Structure formats: structure tokens, C-alpha cells
Amino acid sequence: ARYLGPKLKLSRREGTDLFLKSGVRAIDTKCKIEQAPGQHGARKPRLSDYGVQLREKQKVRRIYGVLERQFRNYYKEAARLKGNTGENLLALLEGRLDNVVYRMGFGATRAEARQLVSHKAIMVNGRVVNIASYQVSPNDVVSIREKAKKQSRVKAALELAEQREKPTWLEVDAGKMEGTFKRKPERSDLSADINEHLIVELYSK
Amino acid sequence: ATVNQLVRKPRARKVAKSNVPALEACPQKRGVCTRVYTTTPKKPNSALRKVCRVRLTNGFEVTSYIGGEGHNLQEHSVILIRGGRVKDLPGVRYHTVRGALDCSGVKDRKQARSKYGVKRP
Amino acid sequence: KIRTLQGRVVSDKMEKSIVVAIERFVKHPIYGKFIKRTTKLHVHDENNECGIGDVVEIRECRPLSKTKSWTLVRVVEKAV
Amino acid sequence: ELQEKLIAVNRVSKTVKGGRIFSFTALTVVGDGNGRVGFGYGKAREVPAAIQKAMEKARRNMINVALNNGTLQHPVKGVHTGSRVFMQPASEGTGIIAGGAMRAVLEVAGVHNVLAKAYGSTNPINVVRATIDGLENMNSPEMVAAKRGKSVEEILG
Amino acid sequence: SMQDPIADMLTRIRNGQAANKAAVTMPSSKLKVAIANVLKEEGFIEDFKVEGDTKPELELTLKYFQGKAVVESIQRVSRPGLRIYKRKDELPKVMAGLGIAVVSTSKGVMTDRAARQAGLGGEIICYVA
Amino acid sequence: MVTIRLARHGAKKRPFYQVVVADSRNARNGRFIERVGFFNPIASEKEEGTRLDLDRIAHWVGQGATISDRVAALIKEVNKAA
RNA sequence: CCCGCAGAAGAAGCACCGGCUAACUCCGUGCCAGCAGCCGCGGUAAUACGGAGGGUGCAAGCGUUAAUCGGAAUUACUGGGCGUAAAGCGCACGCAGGCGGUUUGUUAAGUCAGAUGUGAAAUCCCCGGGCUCAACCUGGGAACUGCAUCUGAUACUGGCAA
RNA sequence: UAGCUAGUAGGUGGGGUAACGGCUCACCUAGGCGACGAUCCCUAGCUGGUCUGAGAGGAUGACCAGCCACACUGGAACUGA
Numbered sequence A: 001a002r003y004l005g006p007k008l009k010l011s012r013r014e015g016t017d018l019f020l021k022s023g024v025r026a027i028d029t030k031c032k033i034e035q036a037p038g039q040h041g042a043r044k045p046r047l048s049d050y051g052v053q054l055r056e057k058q059k060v061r062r063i064y065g066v067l068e069r070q071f072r073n074y075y076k077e078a079a080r081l082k083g084n085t086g087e088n089l090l091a092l093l094e095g096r097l098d099n100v101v102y103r104m105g106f107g108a109t110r111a112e113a114r115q116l117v118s119h120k121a122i123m124v125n126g127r128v129v130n131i132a133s134y135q136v137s138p139n140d141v142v143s144i145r146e147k148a149k150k151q152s153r154v155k156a157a158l159e160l161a162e163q164r165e166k167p168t169w170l171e172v173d174a175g176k177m178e179g180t181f182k183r184k185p186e187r188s189d190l191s192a193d194i195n196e197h198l199i200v201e202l203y204s205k
Numbered sequence B: 001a002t003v004n005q006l007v008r009k010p011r012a013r014k015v016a017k018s019n020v021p022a023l024e025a026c027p028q029k030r031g032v033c034t035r036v037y038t039t040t041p042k043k044p045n046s047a048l049r050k051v052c053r054v055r056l057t058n059g060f061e062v063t064s065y066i067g068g069e070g071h072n073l074q075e076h077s078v079i080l081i082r083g084g085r086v087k088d089l090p091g092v093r094y095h096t097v098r099g100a101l102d103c104s105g106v107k108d109r110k111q112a113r114s115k116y117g118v119k120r121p
Numbered sequence C: 001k002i003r004t005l006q007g008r009v010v011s012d013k014m015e016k017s018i019v020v021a022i023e024r025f026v027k028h029p030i031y032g033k034f035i036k037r038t039t040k041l042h043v044h045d046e047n048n049e050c051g052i053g054d055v056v057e058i059r060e061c062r063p064l065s066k067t068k069s070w071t072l073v074r075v076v077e078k079a080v
Numbered sequence D: 001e002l003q004e005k006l007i008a009v010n011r012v013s014k015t016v017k018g019g020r021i022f023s024f025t026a027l028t029v030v031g032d033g034n035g036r037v038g039f040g041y042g043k044a045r046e047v048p049a050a051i052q053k054a055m056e057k058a059r060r061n062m063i064n065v066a067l068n069n070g071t072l073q074h075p076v077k078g079v080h081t082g083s084r085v086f087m088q089p090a091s092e093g094t095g096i097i098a099g100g101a102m103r104a105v106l107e108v109a110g111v112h113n114v115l116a117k118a119y120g121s122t123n124p125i126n127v128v129r130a131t132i133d134g135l136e137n138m139n140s141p142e143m144v145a146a147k148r149g150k151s152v153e154e155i156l157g
Numbered sequence E: 001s002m003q004d005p006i007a008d009m010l011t012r013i014r015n016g017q018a019a020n021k022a023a024v025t026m027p028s029s030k031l032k033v034a035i036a037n038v039l040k041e042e043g044f045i046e047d048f049k050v051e052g053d054t055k056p057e058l059e060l061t062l063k064y065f066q067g068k069a070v071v072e073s074i075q076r077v078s079r080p081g082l083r084i085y086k087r088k089d090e091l092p093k094v095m096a097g098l099g100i101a102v103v104s105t106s107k108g109v110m111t112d113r114a115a116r117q118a119g120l121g122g123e124i125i126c127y128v129a
Numbered sequence F: 001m002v003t004i005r006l007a008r009h010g011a012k013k014r015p016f017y018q019v020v021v022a023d024s025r026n027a028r029n030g031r032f033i034e035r036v037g038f039f040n041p042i043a044s045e046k047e048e049g050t051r052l053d054l055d056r057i058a059h060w061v062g063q064g065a066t067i068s069d070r071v072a073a074l075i076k077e078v079n080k081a082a
Numbered sequence G: 001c002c003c004g005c006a007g008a009a010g011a012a013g014c015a016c017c018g019g020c021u022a023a024c025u026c027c028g029u030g031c032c033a034g035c036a037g038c039c040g041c042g043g044u045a046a047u048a049c050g051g052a053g054g055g056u057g058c059a060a061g062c063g064u065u066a067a068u069c070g071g072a073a074u075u076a077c078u079g080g081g082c083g084u085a086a087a088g089c090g091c092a093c094g095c096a097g098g099c100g101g102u103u104u105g106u107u108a109a110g111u112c113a114g115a116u117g118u119g120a121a122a123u124c125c126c127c128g129g130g131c132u133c134a135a136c137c138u139g140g141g142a143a144c145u146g147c148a149u150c151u152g153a154u155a156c157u158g159g160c161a162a
Numbered sequence H: 001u002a003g004c005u006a007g008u009a010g011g012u013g014g015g016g017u018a019a020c021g022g023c024u025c026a027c028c029u030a031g032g033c034g035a036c037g038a039u040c041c042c043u044a045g046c047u048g049g050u051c052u053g054a055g056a057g058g059a060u061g062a063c064c065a066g067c068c069a070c071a072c073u074g075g076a077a078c079u080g081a
Ligand SMILES: [Mg+2]
Pocket: none
């Protein structure tokens, strides 16, 4: 169901910073990033056309914390929806509750946001929700319950979110731990680096 | 070609035969087993390949390759047979499932133990 | 009006009955080309009115034997 | 405006009195990513020497491709030798769902999303020329408007 | 022997353009004129006549823009061996709508674009790229 | 004897009755003439719940179709009750 | 379904990693043992065998096997061919059959347009709604490449004409 | 597997069927099916659908639903809407 392994190892293999081990400190400089995937990171890969696609797919999975079976289902939904197939893949991932909770600032990492969702802390439209893959509808109000409000893990994690870019599509109160998911996320608003194109190709064959 | 020739005699679709007559689309079949013996391969290989004449339950009489290093098959001993040619021994078109029934697991195998039917270390 | 069918006669040497072919110009499902498919029917008629080889109008009716459910309506264009 | 890339590398033999001397053949397709493509074959004694020889030819032998937004204008064949090469425009969705060699030429040409399939043989050299023959053949509605001398709106609309 | 007359017309056009030939003479007919007029109307052919009383010879005048010919490709679809009649919604669009398909519908012979808006279909004679 | 009865569709522990005009002999879920609305017992206080097309009921009950114990009361629920 | 309790506590996988196919270092059982889906590996220095070992890969499953389609435009209607690769009967005549030059009529079989009936429900699809989300269930439309009739276009094909 | 077929193919008349009908009889005529596949052979429940496919197609018809068929194997009727 979850990875629960060495998280920063995934970032080296992929190369870029995946925000798995983001947390309290801003920058790591604490893994020999890029040049050490495993025992043979010095080996320059040839890297085929199937490779680059499969690396790009694994990047987007490992960022959002999703497995192949559930990720393949997002592609199937993304294809059936109107407009661009690539933009839908990412938009459906960004609409996940564990992703929204991370983007609100209620969690130093996305795994923390997932557990915070799982453990009955998160609540939306006056209803408790346990599911990380809960598709957050446009015009919703995610929030933390009064029992687990202002605990140790959340207040330190919300201060990290000030250093972050902060999305335009959602808004956060910050005083009373209350969020507001407004519109669906745009392509140009977020990332500007992870290529959807190559993921659309991989599943088509 | 010629659309009227196709009306008169349609496109006869190529009915390709199955490779493995274990019959009735069976994943495996039970074999009582007779004569366990070694055999040499074709051209570039040269070896003593382990193989046995399988008296299948349905009435067929085939040969099946015994994979892995060593085995407990002898004379009789009931064995489970899966599909799959070896591509070396001409005539052999099946494998004995290691681990199933009387065919025991291979001794001291650790990597790839679903194949060869071995337990945890 | 009644659902009649035109058709050319095949044989009339049966006493009080007539076998009639009905050419229908249906197309082939797969290949798309048309076909001149035939429908041979047994038909009832009083006396030997229509001979061999002539156009005949036919109407659906009560069964009056084993086969021969259809019945004659009228003669149009007699035998040459 | 480089966007240069390799399709195939293949070693080939001459055979002489002494023995069989091996040379290597490259196949590089280059383009701006905005309606310019150019395959360049090249051949040399060593591998990395051959791809530079291929790249020099590729830049000069360059064809123009008038294309709509980030895709083709119409469904277009482009036969060459024993490679048919069919490719459809498709929408703003999808990506370049085309074969190896057949898509290296497309992605550097500047088409972002097409349907495509290579019938007959699928030899890396001939399919790359087949695509270039297909793309060079592929006209646009601005060309077609001027060709018949009618109107850009009356044809399209 | 000379079974399809309309296919023979479209070949004389396809070969005339390949030969860089100015005009294309051939025997005339009712249907021949209808297709030649539709090709002229849009602008593949540049003018034509039907000079003759007893044995009329319809001669076309082929168009050229650059060194290249105007008629990129032209082919018979509904041929006598296999007649092809298409319904209103199922009518084709040649070259993604920048070429035409000459379709015989009731309200005279006309283009596929005209057939869609007029609200009917019929026998698609030939694609014209 | 034609009769207006509930068909029972829906998941386990989550029934959804398809009130339907069928022959008495035919099975519960099987053969029928025409379906005439529905009933949802686990709908609760919200937007939807029970819908029953009363124009079609008059066509069958007026002719000669018996109404089952439940469907008789769902007529009593939709008309008046409140 | 809700609320209190205790303490990370109870909670992992099995493929393969020459090539095709993301993933290689070495101790190797020296054409022995074995591998294998194809090409092929293994003959005292192996990414291709066992093993330890980094990963590669997948997750409560994963493999192997059987079975149908796909890729196979390798039965091709959309969409292949037949000088030399497999493939023009040794060459004629010819009924049935397929196809048929051309202008005026005339029909309306084909053909197309319309309309009405029907194409059970479920399924599929879209719009929705409902169960903590999801599978799942479910309201409402489209569709069911139909067919049948009834009335019309009659360009094109046929019929019946000159 | 190119020929099959004698209640066989039609008629008149009698009986029988809830109902028409070689359904079944008596006589009469010599037909009927067949190269747009009869006959004989092998296999097969059929459909809505299912899986697959860009689609055309290809394969299949477990579960759910409609229809047929069968009830130890071959018959026959009785009772009944
Ligand atoms: Mg799961």
C-alpha cells in the first residue's frame, strides 16, 4: 500500500528533489544527490526511450505517493475526461486529499499529510475523512478537528509552508488550521518541470 | 483480392494448432510417471538433461523436463506437469512442476524459489 | 394496403399451386458489395392461371399445406 | 536551434583479401522543434567519428514542414522503399504514439501529438525517409487556399 | 471493355497533370459534365467546354499553381464493381476537410460540404485531394 | 394475474427496490411488462428517496392489476400521508 | 457508524536484472552442473549457470503455466499481393453468374430524406446521485452500426420503354 | 458428402386438433428440395452481453437477466387453466 523504505534513495535515482524528505530543513546537501543512486551511481546510463518514460512515470508516482495499480486507474479516468489527457493525469493527482493537505501546509511532507488524513485529524465540509485518495471537489473546505488541533507536528509544519511557493488555486487561514480548496489546479500554476507527455506515451502502448 | 471472389469464397482464417496436447486448456496435469532417464541435446550444447516419460491421466504418453539441480523422481512417483518446451531436446514439450505433489523442491535454492518450489531460509 | 411481394415463377406443374422466386438486392455484411439473393416460395392459386416464367404478385396468408403459406394476388405481365 | 538526436547505429562489413574491416553507420535526425526536420546518414571507421559526420550532413539536408499548432494538418501517407508510414493529426491531447525511428523524426520536427504506424518493413533508415516524404508532402490550408485561388474561409469554413 | 466511364475521366485528369498537359479531351455525358462542373466550381479545373453536336467532346483545361499541379490526388470510390452509398452523418471528409468528395445526391451532384448543410447523403463518386 | 410489485435490486445490506408491473408467476427480478418508478428504503432525509409514476398505475390498476402489500402503502406514502 | 483505552506497538511480498526489457560488481560447480520466451549462454578471468550481493521491479500479492485477442497490413472490407521472393490455369469457345457506351421519356426495386412504431431490462457511455472515498449500488438522457411500415427527394444503379 | 426424397410434393373428400395444416387417412396427379449448397457427416444450447481491438473485425456465451431444451434410459397417456 505504501513504500515505507529509504525515501531519499528515490530522489537520487530520479535525480531531482521529490519533496519526500523535505521536512523541517529547506535543503538537504546530505546524500550525494544525483551522482549516487546505488552501488554504481558513477555509471553513466545509456537510457533508452522506454527508460526516460519509465523514469518520468516513477518520478510522478514517488512524488505523490501512488502505486502502479491506482496510478493506471487515474490514466483511465484522465483519458475518459474532456480536454487534454496529460493535464487530467496531473489534475486528478493534485485533487487527492493527502496532496491538498500537504499544499495547505498541514504536514511537513506528503507522507505526513497522508497519515494526518488517515488518523481522523482531517475533516472536510463537516465530515471526517480517512482516505488519502479522496478526490477533493472544487469549492470545498478542508480543516483539522478540534481534538488534534494545534498539536506538536502541525504548528512546526505550517511554518515550513511560508518558505514554500504556495499554490494560487487554494487558500489557507493559518490561525484556526482551516483550508479552502477553491478551483481545479492549472497546468501552468504548478511544477513547471515534470513532463506529462512521456507518461501519456508509456501507458498508450 | 477481387471483391466478388471474396463473396463466393470468404477469407479462410488460419486455424493455428496448439503447441501442447495436455488438452482441455488445462494449466497442469497429473502424471504417474514411468522411466526416469538422461538424454543429450542437439548441436551447440552437450549435457545430460534430466527427463521422464509421463503417463498422463487423460491417456496421453509424453516426456517432461525435470528442472533444477537434482530430484526425487524415480520409477513411479506422481508428478504435476506444466506446459513449456525446452528448445534443445527434440520431442520434450513439458516441464515437471517442482514442489507440487511428490516432486520435491530443489535443495539449497534461495533466489527464484517459486520456480523450483523451495521454502524460506 | 396489403404487404405484397413481386416475384418471377419457377415452376407450375403441381396442380392448384405454384413455386415462385423473389429476387432481393441485399448487400454483403462484411465486404460491402451487393448480391442478387433469391427467395423461392411455394404459393397457392386457383387453376393453372400463371404458367412457367412470368412475374407474379404474392401476399402472406393462412397455411394451407406443409409449406405453401403464401397466396396469389393477381397476374402482371403474362408468360412470353 | 539544435535539438539533434540519434535514431540508429549499425556496424557493417566490407570483406577484402586480408579479412573483414568493420565500419559503422549512423542515422541522426535534427530540427528546430518548429517545422524543420533533417535526417543525415553518415558513415565512418570509428563509432563516435561517424555520428559527427552524420550530424554535419543532417543540418544541411533540412526540409520545411508547415504544421498546425503542435500537430499535422491531415492524415497523410508517405511511402518509401518497403515502409508505408501512416500518421493522423490527432487532438491537443495525447503524445507522439509512434514507433522508434518514426517518432525521433516527429518529436524534433516539432509535432507534439500524433497517431502513427509503420506498415510493411520497419527499417530505421527507410521509415525516417518515409516520414520526411510524408511530412514534406503534407500541405496546409494556407497553401491550399492560394492553390485553388478561392478563399481561406470558404474552403475551411 | 470501357465499363466505368467516370473512372476513365478521373485518370485522364490524373495523367494529364502528371504529363504537365494543358487540356484533356474525352467523350462527354450527362454525369461527366456534372462532375467537371463541381471540380471547376471549387477550383481544381480552370474552365471547360462541350464542343460538338452528334459526337460531343468535353475538353477540360487543367490548372497549375507553381511547377506543381493543383490536383494532388484523385480517385474513384463508388466504382461499378462495388457501389458505395453513404448516409448524411456518415459522409466522408477528404484530407481533413481541405479536399472534397464529389457525392451524387438528389439535388444535383455536389460536394460533401454542400451535402452536409443541404441535409442529405448519397453515392460518393470520387475523393479529390 | 398481473401485479405491481417490488423487484429488489442493489448491493448487500443496501437494498434498492424497482417497483415494477409483472405477471404473478414470473420471478421477483425476472420478466416484466414495464417498470413504474422506484423505492429507496435507505435514502434518508435529503434530495431523493421514492418516486412512483401514478399515471401508469391507473392504466394497470384501473384495468385489473393487484397491488402488493408494500406498493399499496408507497401509494399511501406519496399521496397525502404528510 | 460514534466515543474512551493502551502503546509503533500486531502487520510483508515474489519476479528478474546478456539482448528484446527499467536493472552488474564477483566469488563461478569449467559445454560438468545447469539456463532458456526468442537470439542464444556455459570449453580455468561471465552482466546469460547456483550462490552470497547492490540494485531493477513490482506490492498483498507476485511469479510460472493454460487459454482469447492484440502487435500480425502474417486471410488485408476499411488495409496485402501474383516478371525473378509463395503465387497467371498450356491455350481457346461458352451457358449460369458478375459488369456494361450513350439521349429523350416512364417507374421507384436499389439509393437517399423524412416521419411513425419498435430495437425488453441490465450492460456500455455521458450527466448525476448515493453509501468516510473507492470498487459497488443507483436517478435521468444518449445508444442498441436493427428492422418494419407510411410518405417524399430521383442525381446515381436497375427495371419497362423510344 | 451431389444427389436426396414416397405421406414423399400438391388436390378432393372423410376424420381429428383450443386452433390451420399430410396433423392423419382414403383416392388422384408426379412432384418437391438441390450448385445463392439439398443430402450425409462432425461439432454446438441460443440471446442480452463478456473479453479484445484505433475501429472494422476476432474470440467467446461462467456469474446476473430473457427464451428453449432435459429430469435414472426409451416410451405412452391420465389429471388439469
Ligand atoms: Mg490493493
